[PDB]
Amino acid sequence: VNPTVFFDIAVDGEPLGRVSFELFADKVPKTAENFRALSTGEKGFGYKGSCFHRIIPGFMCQGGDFTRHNGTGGKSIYGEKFEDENFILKHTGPGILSMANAGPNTNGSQFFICTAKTEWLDGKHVVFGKVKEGMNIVEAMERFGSRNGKTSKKITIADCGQL
C-alpha cells in the first residue's frame, strides 16, 4: 500500500490546517521514498519547519528548500541530486505532486503542488504523489501567493510525518 504523509501548515505561525498526500511508491519508489523520509525527518534532516517560498495562484505552490528557504537550496536523501526516475505519471490537474528541478537529473528536495493542469511539464518533471485530504487547505494557501510568486505571509510546514 502506498504511504501517506501529512503537512500541518501554518501562516505567520498561526495554524491553518492539514494536507495529506498519497505517494505513488508503486510507480516511482525512489522518488516517493525521498519525499517520505524528508517528511519524517528520519535521516536527520527534512521538511519540518521549512517554508513554501513560491506560490502562484492558478499554477502551483512550491516548497522543500529547507537549507536556503528561497529556491536555491535543498538536498535529497541520496545526495545533492538524483536522477529522473521515470515519467509514467502526468500533470493531470490540481493536487498533483511533482519534483522541481534545474535540468535533467537534478532532483533534490524541492517540489510543487499543482493547483491547475500543467501539461507542459509532462516528461520534464517527475510526478510522484497527489493530495488525498485537505485540498481546501492548499486552496487557502494559494490566496497568500502573488503573480510573481512572493507570499504575503510566511507559509510554513509546522509539522509533518507519516500517517
Side-chain angles (χ1 to χ4, degrees):
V1 150
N2 283 333
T4 300
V5 299
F6 74 89
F7 290 174
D8 283 344
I9 303 300
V11 178
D12 277 353
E14 291 297 330
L16 178 63
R18 175 172 285 191
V19 185
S20 70
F21 311 96
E22 175 180 358
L23 309 178
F24 302 134
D26 58 334
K27 303 291 266 180
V28 275
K30 183 167 178 169
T31 309
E33 173 63 9
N34 179 62
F35 192 90
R36 189 204 63 78
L38 295 172
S39 297
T40 68
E42 63 195 63
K43 297 295 189 178
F45 52 93
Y47 293 138
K48 185 173 179 182
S50 68
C51 75
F52 283 83
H53 65 276
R54 184 175 180 85
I55 300 179
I56 302 168
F59 183 18
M60 57 94 113
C61 304
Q62 184 171 346
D65 180 357
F66 58 84
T67 66
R68 301 188 61 75
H69 328 292
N70 63 9
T72 64
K75 63 176 179 179
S76 85
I77 64 166
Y78 311 115
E80 197 175 51
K81 56 189 174 60
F82 70 101
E83 70 274 16
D84 295 316
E85 187 167 13
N86 63 60
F87 299 105
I88 296 166
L89 299 170
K90 299 179 183 175
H91 301 79
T92 51
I96 287 291
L97 256 176
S98 182
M99 290 302 290
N101 65 51
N105 305 305
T106 60
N107 299 285
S109 58
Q110 291 185 53
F111 61 88
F112 54 96
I113 306 165
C114 300
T115 57
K117 182 177 173 179
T118 62
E119 65 274 10
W120 61 91
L121 302 178
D122 291 349
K124 319 194 307 180
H125 297 265
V126 175
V127 170
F128 66 99
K130 74 178 180 182
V131 172
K132 176 165 151 178
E133 297 180 297
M135 189 72 85
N136 54 310
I137 301 304
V138 176
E139 291 168 356
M141 296 165 56
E142 204 180 14
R143 307 196 190 99
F144 299 107
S146 66
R147 284 291 306 277
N148 63 21
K150 193 172 187 175
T151 62
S152 56
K153 297 184 182 300
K154 197 67 168 183
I155 309 302
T156 59
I157 300 164
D159 200 9
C160 49
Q162 193 169 349
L163 292 178

